[PDB]
Amino acid sequence: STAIFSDRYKGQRVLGKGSFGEVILCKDKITGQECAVKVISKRQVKQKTDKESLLREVQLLKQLDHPNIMKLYEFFEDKGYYYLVGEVYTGGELFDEIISRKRFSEVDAARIIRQVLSGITYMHKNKIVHRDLKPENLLLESKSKDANIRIIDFGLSTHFEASKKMKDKIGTAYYIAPEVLHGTYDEKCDVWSTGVILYILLSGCPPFNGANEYDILKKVEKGKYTFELPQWKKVSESAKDLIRKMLTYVPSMRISARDALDHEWIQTYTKEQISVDVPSLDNAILNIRQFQGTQKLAQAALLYMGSKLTSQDETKELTAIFHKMDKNGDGQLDRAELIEGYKELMKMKGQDASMLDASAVEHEVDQVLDAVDFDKNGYIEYSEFVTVAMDRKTLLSRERLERAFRMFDSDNSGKISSSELATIFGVSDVDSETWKNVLAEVDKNNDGEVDFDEFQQMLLKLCGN
Template identity: 45%
Template sequence: MGCSPSNSRSNDSKNSIVCVKRQISNLQSLQIDAGIFVGKRKGDISKDYKIEDKLGQGGYGFVRGGISKETGKKVAIKSIKKSTITNDMKEKAKFFSEVDILIRTDHPNIVKLYEFYEDENYYHLITEYISGGELLDFIIKRNNLSESSASKFMKQILSGIVYCHSNNIVHRDLKPENLLLDSDSPNALLKIIDFGTSQIFKPRTHMTQKYGTIFYIAPEVLKGRYNEKCDIWSCGVILYILLSGRPPFSGKTDEEIYQKISRGFISFERPEWASISPSAQSLIRKMLQKDPSLRISANEALHHSWIVVNSLDDHTKELNSDVKMQSLENLKNFRAEYKLQQAVLTFIASQIDSQEESKKLIEAFKELDKNGDGKLSQEELIEAYKVKIGHNAAINEVETIMKKADANKSGFIDYTEFVIACSKAEMMLCNNNLEQAFRALDQDCSGKISAKELKEVLGGRIRSKEKLWKKLIDEVDENGDGELDIDEFKEMMLKMIDSNGNKI
């Protein structure tokens, strides 16, 4: 099917109208999501990043800090030796699976991937830098945590895992070393990292490859037949350690530990458990249920009474309520008239972040996300709006919001879409952010954005001729030269801000 020439003028005219309608329809259906700007580069990474000291090392390679020479942004650089994977197709597939999974994910408790490089000897993953260290170090400093602190961390872990499982992603190596914090505080934002052993799974099927770390590995993984609930076992072990400072299954040798895991017997007899609530112990037992068919799901664990009761204090509830109401107001008022505006906002929200602003939006997002699946449904938004404007008005309001804010046409408001609609205009559309976004689209560094460049950056989701992308340029091309310069680009974006400095 396509827009083909006709022998008759009448048919030619009809075909032309149909062709234009198709292009407009394609433009409206263009899916813009958080992973659209994650690109692959070849060459020397040090041309674009100042490389800093190592943060960690493993058999695959190492992780270093880095600073973008273009933006000054601090990042983490995970470098994988090509020699360890190029001769093993399974290992190579595993690496690219990690890249694909990180591109797909859009959740506040999952590390962001910005881009990846390939040079002669290494693959490099460029991710967000998380400054507070590992959850393991946090536990070691304190030996064990209060139930309130432990529940706040566990809620964040489970939220990320609910999101993964609902998108058919299994992590397979959850442990405190793969959970990073943005500060050394019980109120820190937690991020799940290292998806190197993760996999896209088919529901109601089993995996057989043995992955995981000795203390956290589920008994069914040792048997070589398991599903996504292996992650829940790992979460149960993590919670046990958070509350007691020691693992539930230990021994002098690996074999002894494996035997204890296989038996699956959990003890709460040590003195430290005397002060831990029965509710916490109940959740651990449900997560460390030996039979995975009887084991609690990630969603059930997230909504367990111990998590719900302990993870929020009164001050946080009050703060979340204020932020939630402001976010709902911003979401209602959001308007992106052009597809290109949506694309630019997506780049800014997914690649550039303000930690203080992000934390407030994360809390508001999770307050609205009642089922914890990492996205906002129409029903969840209607439930929130009806408190203020009534049920029928809420239905109409949410239908309008979905049309404006659901940029990837998923039928939900994803986390990045929520950030776009609810962030402060002065933070999102500051001069520095707009210039970075312009450079991301100006692939040949000519100082102008062409239809060809838009197709290269945004065209992966849709098959179309270049004139579709020219139409996207023409919508905002003030001087009519068929390209977008920096002044036209900024003017297009700043049209979204009203006289009071709010996004419209």
């Protein structure tokens, strides 16, 4: 009688892959209610605690309500997985919204930060620490300018190991409190992370910056930072005073999320009726765009390479399953067999694949059978099927990376400089000598720049393809 996830919910589409696992948009089979479900592996991702402590924390989370915290509704567990069923937001990540703004003021920044600090204050009262607070964990209810912010992933840090692949830890280093690196931490680490977000909101630049993860962490662990940049001339002294208190090194001296809410900067700048100036922080928005574009292109590059690996397996494997199904060895198959064979390949796409993969077959097959047999004969050469099935998969991969490359190239030059490659690859933790070797191989007469096709050729080479 133990409740089963699939008895209750069916997956509609993938929302995205955040830390700890994939997020799937799901639908209650009775009531129609849409939920977001975080599917976490017991293997791939594993566990810090024992099960008792996790179940306890889960039970606590289901009873808490705040307008700036993502509501957890249900928890399920099967042998391979845990399912965290929660509220769904569609407004996207905070920074992705802010970069589309034409204008952005200290009041815009203070209102955003008050929501964050109100969320944090409530959770800390309930002895729940986030630990991994960063922009990606701040989602908007709506792509509206005035939208409410919901913090995702409170409490998860305590119970599951963070994925050590670089795709999943890009961005992480800027936000992490120094005491967390050293191992003795408490709820003050969330105030530090928030201070880092605020700093970025006001200047467009990390307080603790660097060419790669470890250069950043070094800076964090020293804890020194400045307001030297010229755009800090345009920020109030009150905003800087709050920042100094949230980025106080020694945690016992750092300000609480509760007192940060009371700071005069918050109380002044988050009036309903604006009694202060709102000069646009035009330089900060420009830096935020660059920052975000850089981070998104670096993630896209790693996902492109990741996707290119995981699917090399497919072409050969799919051909094998299809050959083995071809008892008579005529190189052909019907639609039922090709469907079955493609499910087989998702059945074994790692021990772990995406949950909607078995279901996406039928319509993804029909989409291939259209290109290979538009008159619907029904005895199909499976090599051509494989050829077109995987041709489409590769193209779709190319398109997500292209999209990110285009966004990075904000002045529509069509190209990215070697120094920009150096930055992107630093973020992605690709060795400098290694990518340059690759560049010289792809195009000897490169003259300090690459277009999209050359950038994509480099990536292919950096994953052995």
